Amino acid sequence: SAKDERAREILRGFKLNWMNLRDAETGKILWQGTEDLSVPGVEHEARVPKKILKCKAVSRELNFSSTEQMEKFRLEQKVYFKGQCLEEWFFEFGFVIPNSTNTWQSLIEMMPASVLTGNVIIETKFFDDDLLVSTSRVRLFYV
């Protein structure tokens, strides 16, 4: 199918270059990285500071490249605790220019760290509109 082939083309041309999280209130950097966590088929890992769990809101910046044009680039992210979905987040970037590099700022808005750590999976789905480009997993440790 044409839609399957396009999804792979977009996947093929897609790269996450760097990313970070800040406390929304203070603007202070909780975490940053250049590990491409979008990469499917691999269980990624990330160590975040436990104080992030007390933030009312977190500001995330992503920087990505795409060789392919996308009309409605967006993400669905699901927070699993021991295999149980606890929340779902939706973010929309919109139109992506072919061969562009883009910064995307999104705002994200309770068990203790010690219970959560190692038991939280973030499952991220990359879409162009209804077309599923990629599915990726990150296990979180809180330190």
Ligand SMILES: O=S(=O)(c1ccc(S(=O)(=O)N(Cc2ccc(Cl)cc2)C2CCCC2)cc1)N(Cc1ccccc1)CC1CCNCC1
């Ligand atoms: O601090 S969090 O653990 C968290 C922050 C940021 C992310 S993320 O989506 O921005 N990101 C996952 C991710 C981002 C982009 C991509 Cl492409 C792939 C994966 C990770 C976080 C650590 C490294 C990057 C996921 C989870 N936490 C998620 C959560 C919700 C309910 C119960 C437990 C945990 C964020 C909330 C923020 C508001 N205050 C309460 C916690």
